[PDB]
């Protein structure tokens, strides 16, 4: 089996693009599961909702030993996506579709996992409204501002920058981008 590079899509509509790749090509795209020290709720399922960690000290040590591409605290419990969880998907020859922040890109590269980082760049506020038709003007201005700051601060880590007048255009480009950079 050949290693498949993990994927981090960023920018407006990245979550729709993530869901679409998984639902269209389940043979080439997969997901991994985050870790948490929060205790498991009865209905939750270990290895499915989270990898539930019983020792907060254990997770703290692993975070400091760089075992996570992303980690943080909420409601006094730890949360993170582990290097190994990405590696397992990649080793099985599937692109791991990651829903992580841009700071994870550098951590994935430093962990030698060779990510594909794709930035969907809005051309303007109006372009945001073209490609996401379910949001208010305010939400679109917030998305546009976030994308401007994202590009200003993280443009050096992008594998590809994609643009378009509709989500369909962006999605076709995203798929074509992944095929070009994987071969």
């Amino acid at each position: 089996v050949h290693y498949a590079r993990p994927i981090i899509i960023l920018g407006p509509t990245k979550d729709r693009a993530n869901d679409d790749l998984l639902s269209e090509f389940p043979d080439k795209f997969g997901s991994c599961v985050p870790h948490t020290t929060r205790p498991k709720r009865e209905y939750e399922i270990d290895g499915r909702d989270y990898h539930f960690v019983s020792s907060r000290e254990k997770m703290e040590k692993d975070i400091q030993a760089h075992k996570f591409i992303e980690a943080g605290q909420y409601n006094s419990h730890l949360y993170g996506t582990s290097v190994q969880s990405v590696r397992e998907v990649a080793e099985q020859g599937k692109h791991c579709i990651l829903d992580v922040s841009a700071n994870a890109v550098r951590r994935l590269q430093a962990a030698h996992l060779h990510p594909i980082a794709i930035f969907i760049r809005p051309r303007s506020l109006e372009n945001v409204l073209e490609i996401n038709k379910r949001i208010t003007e305010e939400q679109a201005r917030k998305a546009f501002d976030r994308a401007t700051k994202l590009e200003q601060e993280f443009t050096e880590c992008f594998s590809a920058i994609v643009e378009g007048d509709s989500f369909e255009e962006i999605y076709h480009k995203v798929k074509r981008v992944i095929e070009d950079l994987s071969g």
Partner: peptide, 14 residues
């Protein structure tokens, strides 16, 4: 497949 707990932990207000 959003995990709201996870997103709050990893996207803290700065």
């Amino acid at each position: 497949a959003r995990r709201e707990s996870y997103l709050k932990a990893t996207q803290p207000s700065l």
